[PDB]
């Protein structure tokens, strides 16, 4: 039996408009100047730029000590401790109507699952009830970027999507068949595929809660409608492929 | 055993006013402007259009632009759902402390998923044709209050496959109401309800 | 099955089970019927969204899956079709009319300003017999991912 200590992050500076700075595994992150897309060089016209925290509490740009990058270990971190797994919680929703066909009306409920354990990223992780440092700690970025497309033509769009902003940081010390590309140092999903037998390929959703309301204006008049507004976080899925 | 690649042949994009005799005694239809789902009762603006299951529109009357997608039956090879998660989330808690939570969706991408191309597996009992031409209804209702609604009705017409339709039909709903400027306060005037492209089948 | 109950009365506060002040608040007031509110509209509803008029003798009684094809882009470290899976329960644990609050107070608020919102809140009237958010950022032509002028966000029938 071993007990791990608490952990935290490094208080850092909010990015400056026009700064392109480098994080680990070669992914560059840029805080663009107006008139540019993701790459900050290809021609766009009308995007102005300011970052955002996970929980809707934005950050003033150019501010020292503005965010703490959250912390999460490997899945089953005790099984990588020797060279604490969170579970889903069932829930019930409010009442709702239905309709039934046959070859009738009935009432049921909706169900969602939640997780709140150590593998969830948090600010100040409590203590948890040998391997090296960088093989057990991460830096999930605690600051996301949020893009605005204002391009002429037809039409303007309200494209609300999110993407991380990775910065290296100093992590506090703790007081106590398989493809090789999975268990190497250059895999961000190392902490997700250290033990899964088979190759892993990613799947990406941006679910869009959209709605259609009442009256509109000309272009195709009547319903002239296409717009999509997504959630506040990309939902990345893993898929196990056979290797033999 | 090993099967091969599966698809079907092409079709003709119908013109508005055509109703061909579909399988199992259902008459699919594509009503004109200002008419209901059996083309007899007038209405203000409930007018119908065709889009792909991806949402791509189809110009009517085109030749060989869509093929009905194909899926496999239940236990022809079955698959287990794929886990996943979103990012950090924060909401309020009651007790008689901020806490970070994550919600978990699912996914399925097996042979039962309708596809353009069928990967092989390791005749009327195994293969089928999903209706790849769906009718998008942009129903509008005026008055006090005012809602617009969308319900999807299938166009189940068959192709040719190379060498009981199957229930609780749930339509999940989304709502949004805009408020502007607050002098005159007679009555609120808006709601909405928007279904999915496909029925949630229990 | 549950007994018939008459509709509540405006401006009336009662005491129910577990020491809670169940009441039907007035316009311009919050749930406590003492704290002022701006422009709220308060009606009474069945637990399934259909309205019940007040002053009704025996107004109500009490209570005791897949989708279709969706395209998803694939990034590997391609176009593919996958579906979404939900869950539901319809057993004895599911409340029903025939074999809980059989009425619910509606709080059809509106908050103005910059940004604005519009909140529909449910508060369970109970005389004995995780919140979903279609969240928003609404503006005419500003920088779309900064502080807006308006929003529009339903809260559902009952938070999970």
């Amino acid at each position: 039996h071993h007990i791990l200590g608490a952990c935290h992050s490094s208080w850092q500076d909010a990015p400056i408009q026009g700064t392109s700075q480098m994080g680990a595994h070669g992914q560059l992150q840029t805080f663009p100047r107006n008139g540019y897309d993701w790459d900050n060089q290809t021609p766009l016209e009308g995007a102005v730029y300011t970052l955002v925290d996970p929980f809707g509490r934005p950050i003033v740009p150019g501010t020292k000590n503005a965010y703490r990058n959250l912390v999460y270990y490997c899945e089953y971190p005790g099984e990588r401790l020797y060279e604490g797994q969170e579970v889903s919680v069932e829930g019930t929703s409010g009442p709702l109507l239905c309709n039934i066909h046959d070859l009738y009306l009935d009432i049921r409920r909706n169900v969602h699952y939640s997780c709140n354990g150590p593998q969830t990223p948090k600010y100040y992780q409590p203590p948890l009830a040998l391997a090296s440092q960088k093989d057990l700690v991460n830096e999930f970025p605690g600051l996301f970027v949020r893009q605005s497309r204002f391009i002429a033509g037809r039409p303007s769009r309200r494209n609300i999507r999110f993407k991380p902003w990775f910065i290296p940081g100093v992590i506090n010390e703790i007081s106590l068949l398989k493809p090789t590309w999975n268990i190497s140092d250059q895999n961000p999903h190392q902490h997700r595929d250290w033990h899964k037998f088979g190759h892993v390929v990613n799947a990406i959703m941006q679910p869009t809660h959209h709605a259609e309301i009442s009256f509109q204006d000309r272009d195709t008049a009547l319903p002239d409608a296409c717009s999509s507004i997504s959630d506040i976080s990309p939902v990345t899925y893993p898929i196990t492929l056979p290797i033999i | 055993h090993i099967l091969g690649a599966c698809h079907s042949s092409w079709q003709d994009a119908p013109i508005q006013g055509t109703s061909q005799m579909g399988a199992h005694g259902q008459l699919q239809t594509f009503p004109r402007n200002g008419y209901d789902w059996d083309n007899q009762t007038p209405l203000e603006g409930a007018v119908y259009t065709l889009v792909d299951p991806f949402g791509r529109p189809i110009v009517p009357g085109t030749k060989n632009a869509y093929r009905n997608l194909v899926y496999y039956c239940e236990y022809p090879g079955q698959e287990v759902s794929v886990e996943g998660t979103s990012g950090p989330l924060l909401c309020n808690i009651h007790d008689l402390y901020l806490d970070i939570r994550r919600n978990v969706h699912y996914s399925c991408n097996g042979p039962q998923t309708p596809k353009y191309y069928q990967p092989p597996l390791a005749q009327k009992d195994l293969v089928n044709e999903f209706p790849g031409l769906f009718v998008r209804q942009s129903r509008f209702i005026a008055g006090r209050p005012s809602r617009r609604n969308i319900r999807f009705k299938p166009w189940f017409i068959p192709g040719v496959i190379n060498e009981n339709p199957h229930n609780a039909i749930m339509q999940p709903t989304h709502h949004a109401e805009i408020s502007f400027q607050d002098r005159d306060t007679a009555l609120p005037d808006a709601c909405s309800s928007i279904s999915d492209i496909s029925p949630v089948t229990y | 099955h549950s007994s018939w109950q008459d509709a509540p009365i405006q401006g009336t506060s009662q005491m129910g089970a577990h020491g809670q002040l169940q009441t039907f608040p007035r316009n311009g007031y919050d749930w406590d019927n003492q704290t002022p509110l701006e422009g709220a509209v308060y009606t009474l509803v069945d637990p399934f969204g259909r309205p019940i008029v007040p002053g009704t003798k025996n107004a109500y009684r009490n209570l005791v899956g897949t989708s279709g094809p969706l395209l998803c882009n694939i990034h590997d470290l391609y176009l593919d079709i996958r579906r979404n899976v939900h869950y539901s329960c319809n057993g004895p644990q599911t409340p029903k009319y025939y074999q809980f609050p059989g009425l619910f107070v509606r709080q059809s608020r509106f908050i103005a300003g910059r940004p604005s919102r519009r909140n529909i809140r449910f508060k369970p009237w109970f005389i004995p017999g995780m919140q979903p958010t279609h969240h928003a950022e609404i503006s005419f032509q500003d920088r779309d991912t900064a502080l807006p002028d308006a929003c529009s966000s339903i809260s559902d029938i009952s938070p999970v």
Partner: antibody, heavy 122, light 110 residues
Framework: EVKLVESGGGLVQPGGSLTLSCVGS????????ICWVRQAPGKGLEWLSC????????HLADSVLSRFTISKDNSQNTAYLQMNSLRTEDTARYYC???????????????WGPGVEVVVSS | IVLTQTPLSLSVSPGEPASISCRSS??????????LSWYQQKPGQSPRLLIY???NRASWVPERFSGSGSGTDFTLKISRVEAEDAGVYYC?????????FGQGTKLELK
């Protein structure tokens, strides 16, 4: 810089047929509307003629209810305003504008393009 | 529905606020959904956008704009004008079938 690309106009005899173009850039035109905005010279603005977004509802204005067919192409992002039975009334500079919803109201008639002139006479 | 835009001519001193009333002959509904729009000519160029629904600044140009009103009377307010605010201003709405448009009103600098 992103600019509306408008051309294809000219002097057409009455009763004739002409096809215009509203070409945009910097966006995928997968399911997107197009129409024009009329403006008679020295007169207040007005709207002319559309079909629905994928082409379902064919509703026009009062004076133009049977003379205009509107077509686009979802791939090349090039619009077309095809007219028939040309008359003296509809000579105007046509503007290709942007319209959308922000959870259900109008938030844009965003940028009006260069404008090609259709001056007609018998 | 015909919109009533008044007055046609506005003498605007530079810096002073200006008030323009566009009143609808039909009810534009209530505290949620009183709708209108305001577009502006710039002569020699394409006409552009300055105010939405006579409340807030339509374009992302700076804080110098304002607005108020609801119901049937709508007040077009500006806190402090510029030299580029001249032209003719079109109060507009299309929230009903088949089609409506407004008249327009002119701004003059002094």
């Amino acid at each position: 810089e992103v600019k509306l690309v408008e051309s294809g106009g000219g002097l057409v005899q009455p009763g004739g047929s002409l096809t215009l173009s509203c070409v945009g850039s910097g966006y995928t035109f997968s399911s997107y509307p197009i129409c024009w905005v009329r403006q008679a010279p020295g007169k207040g603005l007005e709207w002319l003629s559309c079909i629905d977004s994928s082409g379902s509802k064919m509703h026009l204005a009062d004076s133009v209810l049977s003379r205009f067919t509107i077509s686009k192409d979802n791939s090349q992002n090039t619009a077309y305003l095809q007219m028939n039975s040309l008359r003296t009334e509809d000579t105007a500079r046509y503007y290709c504008a942007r319209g959308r919803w922000c959870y259900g109201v109008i938030c844009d008639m965003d940028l009006w393009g260069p404008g090609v002139e259709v001056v007609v006479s018998s | 529905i015909v919109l009533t835009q008044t007055p046609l001519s506005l003498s605007v001193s530079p810096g002073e606020p200006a008030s323009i009333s566009c009143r609808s002959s039909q009810s534009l509904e209530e505290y949620g959904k009183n709708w209108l729009s305001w577009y502006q000519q710039k002569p020699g160029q394409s006409p552009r956008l300055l105010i939405y629904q006579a409340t807030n600044r339509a374009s992302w140009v700076p804080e110098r704009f304002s607005g108020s009103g609801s119901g049937t009377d709508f007040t077009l307010k500006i806190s402090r004008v510029e030299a580029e605010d001249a032209g003719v201003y079109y109060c507009q709405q299309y929230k009903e079938f088949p089609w409506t448009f407004g008249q327009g009103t002119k701004l003059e600098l002094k």
